């Protein structure tokens, strides 16, 4: 429950401001950046700042501070999730979100902030339906704005009818410095690009363990869906009943389901390395990289980052397969292997220098994070079974799918 939604620059002056209730005065935004530096330099950097009785809920963009002010007990996650939805809708609208978009396209953005929120209440925050009556190129509002189904307007028509499914894996991993797995979970996310005609209804078929236990087919290969969080469009009561993903799809690109599970399968790329940290001379990274998965998949464009000392100099890399760029701007290396097959081990030997004089402060030991990407492969083994298009007209759409294995935060701790 915010009284005034604000966007500041990186200095603290108003890029754009939008009050709703008058509970927060407009002059109180000027205290934000001094309070930001005041709490930040003492380690009290929080998304909620305070100035007496006025709060400052904020998320941070690259150049923008979406300041959301309230005075009374605001509903907090309401405010922060509306900030994220404002970020997502404006990123749909303005593909780069900078001060050139704020200070020059100011005709439409005040109207957007008036439409998305009244009195501190988000009412209609979908991007595609808001496109249909808020343009920069006006008629009545659509009934889909007023409809229960408020993500798919009638009147959409395409020549061909294609449904593109993107099963994207993301292996989360935190391997300690000893060499054991502390957490091997997988957050999977299916994003769909649906180009259909009218008001279709889609029933997704998956190889669920729980659904096959409801069926009696729980002895074949299946996925153990530990948790799934769906879009609004999925009728969740029917999914609670019999694991049924029943949804009218939104139009275009949208993420259907964000599932999460735990996986006791070995990690995809194992990183072993020894570090011979000599005093004031040099460092050595005898890093090896073996793949534990099958000998049929090839990991595209991996970027195995090893964090390095900050003031290293004269970099040397005796590699076997793959190029290295030393990135001292982030104080790291990028050992890039474009084609990384499965079942193979590629060695890399790095050698640096080190200044003879020590530093005033320490540097820290960041873990190893790699950036693999594998097509036609799911580590979970999850497979889409069917996708029944339901239409009053009645036709044959094209449910296409590809399997992508990527990473989430694929961390391996260093010495």
């Amino acid at each position: 429950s915010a009284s005034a939604v604000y966007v500041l620059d990186l200095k603290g002056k108003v890029l754009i401001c939008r009050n709703y209730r008058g509970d927060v005065d407009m002059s109180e935004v000027e205290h934000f950046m001094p309070i930001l530096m005041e709490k930040e330099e003492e380690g009290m950097l929080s998304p909620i700042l305070a100035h007496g009785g006025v709060r400052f809920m904020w998320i941070k963009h690259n150049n923008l501070y979406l300041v959301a002010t309230s005075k009374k007990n605001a509903c907090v996650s309401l405010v922060f999730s509306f900030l994220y939805k404002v970020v997502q809708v404006f990123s749909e609208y303005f593909k780069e979100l900078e001060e050139e978009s704020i200070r020059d396209n100011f005709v439409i953005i005040y109207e957007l902030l008036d439409e998305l929120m009244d009195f501190g209440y988000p009412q209609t925050t979908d991007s595609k339906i808001l496109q249909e009556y808020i343009t920069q190129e006006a008629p009545r509002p659509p009934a889909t704005v007023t409809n229960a189904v408020s993500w798919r307007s009638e009147g959409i028509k395409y020549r061909k009818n294609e449904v593109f499914l993107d099963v994207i894996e993301a292996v989360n991993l935190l391997v300690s410095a000893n060499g054991n797995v502390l957490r091997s979970e997988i957050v999977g996310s299916i994003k769909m690009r649906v180009f259909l005609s009218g008001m279709p209804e889609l029933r997704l078929g998956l190889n669920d363990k729980v659904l096959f236990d409801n069926t009696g087919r729980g002895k074949s290969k299946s996925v153990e869906l530990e948790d799934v969080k769906f879009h609004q469009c999925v009728r969740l009561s029917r999914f609670e009943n019999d694991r049924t993903i029943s949804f009218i799809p939104p139009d275009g690109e949208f993420e259907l389901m964000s599932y999460r599970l735990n996986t006791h399968v070995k990690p995809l790329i194992w990183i072993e390395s020894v570090i011979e940290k000599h005093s004031h001379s040099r460092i050595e990274y005898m890093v090896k990289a073996k793949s534990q998965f099958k000998r049929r998949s090839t990991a595209n464009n991996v970027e195995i980052h090893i964090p390095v000392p900050n003031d290293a100099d004269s970099p040397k890399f005796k590699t076997t397969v793959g190029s290295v760029k030393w990135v001292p701007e982030n104080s790291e290396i990028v050992w890039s292997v474009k084609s990384f097959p499965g079942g193979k081990e590629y060695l890399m030997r790095a050698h640096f220098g080190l200044p003879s004089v020590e530093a005033e402060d320490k540097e820290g030991k960041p873990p190893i994070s790699v950036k693999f990407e594998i097509p036609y492969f799911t580590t979970s083994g999850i497979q889409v079974r069917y996708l029944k298009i339901i239409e009053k007209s009645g036709y044959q759409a094209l449910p296409w799918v590809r399997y992508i294995t990527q990473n989430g935060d694929y961390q391996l701790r260093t010495q």
């Binding site: 593109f164 499914l165 078929g205 079974r385 069917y386 029944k388 298009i389 449910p399 799918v401 590809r402």
Partner: peptide, 13 residues
């Protein structure tokens, strides 16, 4: 989208 697609069966009755 250099990674090509695969077609699923529609019904799986």
């Amino acid at each position: 989208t250099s990674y090509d697609y695969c077609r699923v069966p529609m019904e799986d009755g």
